[PDB]
Amino acid sequence: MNIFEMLRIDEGLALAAYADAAGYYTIGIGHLLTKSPSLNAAKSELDKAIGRNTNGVITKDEAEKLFNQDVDAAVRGILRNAKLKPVYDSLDAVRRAALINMVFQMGETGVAGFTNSLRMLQQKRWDEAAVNLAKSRWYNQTPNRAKRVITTFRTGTWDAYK
């Protein structure tokens, strides 16, 4: 297994836009239409990313293209961050996928907010990080996903996804 299959399991696939638990418009495989509060700004944004004047619905191909774009953006956002990069550099391949998964869901700035947890990961304090990440707004709003991602950081295995 790799990061793309792990995220496909966590993001799912939808060909028309939908609102998440916080009300953010998403489409495809976890693709955020926009950060803006404005709803009108969301469709405009999508069309620019899709590269066509959409009518609301996209194709599986456009979704997978967006997915490739977004997984790449997540990884780069980690490396461009002073708080995330060092953590990433210290982790094994499986756990790096877990970190990317979080950034893909919450964005670089949002993940950089897990100060104590990040530092425990960098120190290889698996169980400590696991208990602390479970005590968060992220876990409360998306507990099934948080649990799987946390199980991954805890064990260093893909068991929560197979």
Q: Which residues are annotated as a binding site for substrate?
A: 32, 104, 117, 132
For residues 85 to 124, the per-residue mask of contacts with Cl ion, x marking binding by CB under 5 A and - elsewhere, is ----------------------------------------
Q: Is 12 near Cl ion (CB under 5 A)?
A: yes
Check if 11 is active-site: yes
Rounded least distance, CB 158 to Cl ion, Å? 18
In the complex, residue closest to Cl ion by CB = 12
Which residue blocks in the chain are alpha helix, DSSP H?
3-11, 39-50, 60-79, 85-90, 93-106, 108-111, 115-122, 126-133, 137-141, 143-155
Could you give the CA distance from residue 140 to residue 135 in angstroms, rounded to a whole number?
Answer: 8
Rounded least distance, CB 148 to Cl ion, Å? 9
- Residue among 31 and 95 whose Cβ is closer to Cl ion: 31
Nearest to 48 by CA among 67, 30, 35, 66: 66
Q: How many residues of this chain interact with Cl ion, rule: CB under 5 A? A: 5
Catalytic residue among 11, 45, 64, 108: 11
Stretch that binds Cl ion, among 14-22, 32-40, 85-93, 95-103 (CB under 5 A): 14-22
Q: What would the DSSP string read from start to end of 140-158?
A: HHSHHHHHHHHHHHHHSSS
Query: Active-site positions?
Result: 11
